[PDB]
């Protein structure tokens, strides 16, 4: 998920701006639900996740808000020491303790005939048992810092909906117990950013990248004050951008640091904001378009590739050509002429170059753990370690010397070019790859079916599942948004689809939007 908030000094109109882009996948019916809520002193328009009695992406009379996932450290795993004579007992604070046991019955549809299966589940003082290592007399239990406070988080979000100023919104933020980033913009020109959640006070004797021994010496000691959560009102830079990246330089997240490295996809939003002076909502939309189509490895890896090839272009004419094509490429995989092929043929070379390079960097050392490390070293948010190795920047382990790294870059180039020459030809326009498409399907990230989906294909975009663009003018929030696939999920018994089942797909695919409605006079004619 991505977000931007723009303060008065960075906004062309001198009004604070907000951009939302939650990434919750693409399903029909959609993951989001758009609504307008109007009662005395409470006027709010926007969307929330399906089933939520509150808006997360939108604006009330006073403030606009959005959120992105925090990735903060709110789950710890405890390694329980099991009694070798009784695997339902674990050692805790000097004594064997008994696990709480629960039997659960599952009715399963077969064929039609229904069957009953039973399973037994265990809890310790730390939480549910998630994994057994019986060989080691260990069980693993899971502690959430928000355990039992999920309803308090709902209440906090409702209070954010009802809030009228920074003080009230910050109060709501301080009560939210799960790990999100919250973003705020108001009609007085203020912007604010909060990394919300209840973050536990951990033992300073343990390495928080690994499970914590569960014997009692290393327990959490409460939760830190909200005043220690990363947060800023009216930061000096004049804006905040985020694409699930790190809140602030010294904020840590334990086992999940793999998302917060030097190479990070938020660079697309930083680049776009820093390349401009004062901005309007149209500028924000252009930044979203760039991020949505960017080949994210280009930011740091395309210059490294060019630098290597340039050293050898006097001997290798194919390298001179590649350099020219790479330099003129705008780093996007886009289809501006809607012909079904990505516009830059060299992007197909670059994709294959990267895949070859990643494998040559790590297969010889991490191949034996690649079922777990490939998701780190080729992560969708960035490839920091690969960047450091190829650039010669300091690492703890000496993966490759600069000479070995350069040979990898060259071998990967030769292999990628040889395959393109064999299958498509020598001109880059022949390399253009067919676009990847996506549908709004039947199964969301909760991993169970919730409808019948849609078969309408649109180009894949690394983009929010909805977008709002809001300007907090003195009169009212104004702007535009899109909430695909459509508002209404109802399909009649006879197969008739609601006219609002997928009537926002074209807007979404074509970078068009519908007006943000706030004034009732506008609503009645919308």
């Amino acid at each position: 998920s991505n977000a931007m908030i723009i303060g008065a000094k960075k906004s062309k109109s001198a009004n604070a701006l907000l951009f939302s882009g939650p990434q919750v996948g693409f399903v029909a019916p959609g993951f989001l639900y758009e609504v307008g809520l109007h009662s005395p002193g409470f006027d709010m328009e926007g969307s929330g996740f399906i089933g939520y009695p509150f808006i997360m992406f939108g604006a009330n009379q006073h403030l606009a808000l959005t959120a992105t996932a925090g990735y903060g450290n709110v789950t710890d795993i405890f390694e329980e020491k099991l009694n070798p004579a009784n695997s339902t007992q674990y050692f805790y604070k000097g004594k064997w303790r008994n696990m709480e046991k629960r039997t659960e019955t599952f009715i399963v549809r077969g064929d039609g005939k229904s069957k009953k299966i039973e399973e037994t589940f265990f809890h310790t003082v730390h939480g549910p048992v998630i994994s057994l290592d019986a060989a080691a007399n260990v069980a693993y239990s899971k502690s959430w810092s928000f355990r039992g406070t999920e309803a308090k988080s709902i209440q906090a979000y409702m209070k954010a909906n009802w809030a009228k100023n920074v003080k009230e919104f910050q109060q709501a933020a301080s009560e939210f117990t799960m790990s999100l980033n919250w973003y705020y913009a108001d009609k007085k020109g203020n912007i604010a950013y909060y990394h919300v959640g209840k973050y536990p006070i951990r033992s300073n004797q343990i390495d928080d990248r690994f499970p914590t021994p569960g014997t009692g010496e290393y327990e959490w000691k409460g939760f830190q004050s909200f005043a220690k959560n990363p947060q800023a009102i009216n930061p000096k830079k004049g804006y905040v951008v985020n694409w699930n990246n790190k809140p602030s330089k010294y904020w840590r997240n334990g086992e999940y640091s793999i998302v917060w490295g030097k190479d990070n996809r938020v660079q697309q939003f930083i680049n776009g904001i820093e390349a401009r002076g004062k901005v309007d909502l149209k500028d924000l939309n252009e930044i979203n378009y760039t991020a949505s189509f960017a080949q994210l490895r280009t930011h740091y890896f395309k210059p490294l590739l060019i630098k290597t090839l340039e050293k050898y272009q006097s001997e290798n004419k194919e390298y001179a050509y590649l350099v020219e094509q790479l330099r003129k490429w705008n780093n996007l995989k886009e289809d501006k002429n809607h012909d079904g092929y990505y516009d830059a043929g060299v992007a197909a070379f670059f994709d294959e170059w990267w895949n070859n390079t990643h494998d040559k960097l790590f297969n010889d050392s991490l191949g034996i753990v690649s079922d777990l490390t490939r998701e780190i070293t080729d992560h969708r948010m960035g490839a920091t370690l690969a960047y450091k190795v190829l650039s010669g920047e300091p690492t703890n382990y000496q993966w490759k010397s600069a000479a070995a790294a350069e040979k990898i870059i060259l071998e990967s180039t030769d292999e990628a070019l040889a395959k393109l020459h064999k299958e498509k030809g020598e001109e880059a326009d022949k390399w253009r790859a067919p676009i990847k498409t996506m549908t709004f399907g039947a199964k969301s990230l909760i991993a169970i079916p919730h409808g019948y989906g849609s078969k309408t294909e649109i180009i894949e975009m690394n983009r929010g599942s909805e977008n709002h663009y809001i300007e907090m003018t003195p009169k009212q929030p104004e702007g535009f948004n899109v909430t695909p696939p459509g508002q209404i999920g109802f399909i009649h018994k006879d197969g008739t689809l609601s006219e609002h089942y997928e009537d926002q797909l074209s807007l979404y695919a074509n970078w068009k939007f519908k007006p943000f409605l706030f004034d009732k006079k506008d609503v009645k004619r919308a």
Partner: protein, 195 residues
């Protein structure tokens, strides 16, 4: 535009805009319009949290239902959560559930017109809702963004590296794979911006 005590204006995209005299009425209407538009989705999201999807979609979802029940909460535990909220807030969540239930009751009485195709095809009926079920709808999606077992993956990475390469090399490699803090990682705010 159509009127209980709440005026509902559906715009040209079908988005409902609710005009109420108080929050109790507003939140009931909010649940009602969401159920009108999304009842089968709401039902299945709830079943996801309760671990009852395999009642509808079969054995392919048994392990998913097991995980959901393993890590989830009983109705009583959720009710205790609701009882710890501000009185008014709990009441509004109850109103929201009453609105969903109002549509359920309408749909089961006129199923051929008001129950969506998936219920007819899968051969079951929607049940009525309580405020605890609203909390379940929050948990099924929000917890996904918070819950992970990366600590266990990390322990496995380190152990496998150590058994082939030895401890000193494995530690260096692991520190490059899952760092303590990359001081060059781009950040949303600067340290001097902190309140």
């Amino acid at each position: 535009q159509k009127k209980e005590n709440v005026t509902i204006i559906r715009d040209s995209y079908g988005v409902p805009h609710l005009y109420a005299k108080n929050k109790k009425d507003l939140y009931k209407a909010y649940g009602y319009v969401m159920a009108q538009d999304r009842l089968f989705q709401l039902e299945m999201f709830r079943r996801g949290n309760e671990g009852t999807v395999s009642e509808i979609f079969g054995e392919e979802y048994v392990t998913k239902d097991e995980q959901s029940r393993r890590d989830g909460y009983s109705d009583q535990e959720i009710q205790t959560m609701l009882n710890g909220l501000d009185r008014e807030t709990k009441q509004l969540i109850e109103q929201f559930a009453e609105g969903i239930t109002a549509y359920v009751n309408e749909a089961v009485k006129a199923p051929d017109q008001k129950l969506s195709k998936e219920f007819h095809d899968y051969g079951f009926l929607p049940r009525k809702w309580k405020a605890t079920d609203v909390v379940r709808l929050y948990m099924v999606s929000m917890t996904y963004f918070m819950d992970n077992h990366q600590e266990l993956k990390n322990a496995e990475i380190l152990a496998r590296l150590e058994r082939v390469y030895g401890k000193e090399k494995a530690v260096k490699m692991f520190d490059d794979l899952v760092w303590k803090n990359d001081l060059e990682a781009p950040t949303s705010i600067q340290p001097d911006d902190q309140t």
